[PDB]
Symmetry: none
Subunit: 153 residues, 2 copies
């Protein structure tokens, strides 16, 4: 339920120098409420129906857990893929819901949530401050990336 906004830096080139780069995170009160109540975290990426985005297919995403002592406490790489639609059903959804997309009320993108972890930050002594996120691709196009440390056991 508390949203968390991140500036995924796209590796100073369109060409794949390394990978996208991340880890801005500081909610210490929600860090403690995650540990004491066994909450979890989920990332959510907003990406359009670009032809480069539709040619992408499956991609990996990965996240880390570095504590207040900057020690790596958790590491999980996750699989992800857009919700595939046929071009016929994209044309039909275009023609049917046309005045919505004309008035800019739906915006031809998809929210792709990727569940990263299920439990808390491994101990009460040194919980996790930032999360080193990277997407294992370079042809991906997206609008924004948002974590969600949800209040869910």
């Amino acid at each position: 339920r508390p949203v968390h906004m991140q500036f995924k830096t796209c590796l100073e080139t369109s060409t794949p120098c390394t990978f996208p780069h991340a880890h801005v995170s500081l909610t210490k009160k929600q860090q403690l409420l995650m540990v004491g109540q066994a909450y979890k975290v989920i990332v959510n990426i907003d990406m359009p129906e670009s032809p480069q985005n539709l040619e992408l297919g499956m991609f990996m995403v990965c996240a880390e857990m570095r504590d207040y002592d900057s020690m790596l406490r958790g590491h999980s790489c996750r699989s992800a893929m857009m919700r595939y639609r046929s071009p016929l059903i994209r044309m039909i959804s275009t023609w049917v819901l046309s005045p919505l997309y004309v008035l800019g009320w739906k915006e031809e993108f998809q929210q792709v949530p990727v569940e990263i972890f299920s439990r808390y930050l491994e101990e009460r002594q040194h919980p996790i401050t930032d999360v080193y996120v990277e997407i294992q691709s370079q042809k991906i196009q997206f609008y924004t990336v948002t974590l969600h440390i949800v209040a869910d056991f």
Copy 2:
């Protein structure tokens, strides 16, 4: 709310010599009102639906913070991308709103705001005068670039 207009110099060639170049900024009273009241800054780029602009996709943008002592106090590179539209919905928005674009009332461009910072200029002793902006591309086409040191905590 105070607007700030910048002359982004396009690197003396259409070919990528280096990168676009920037940093004209002088509002010392608004500099002090940013520091004393924890304001933030956001850039906004006006770019058309050119075929070179639509082929561009994601690009990085980056900004610096050099103070009255000309010391680099802050540095943030940011991700950006146009709001993607399908060619079907561009044709439908063309045919529906046609007399607006004929009379030159909407102008087939997009304003893309990119939030750069969230807080003030790092101290009251030597706040930031100019902002070294660069766009990490050379195929980008735009009309103008405008910062907004908004009065927002």
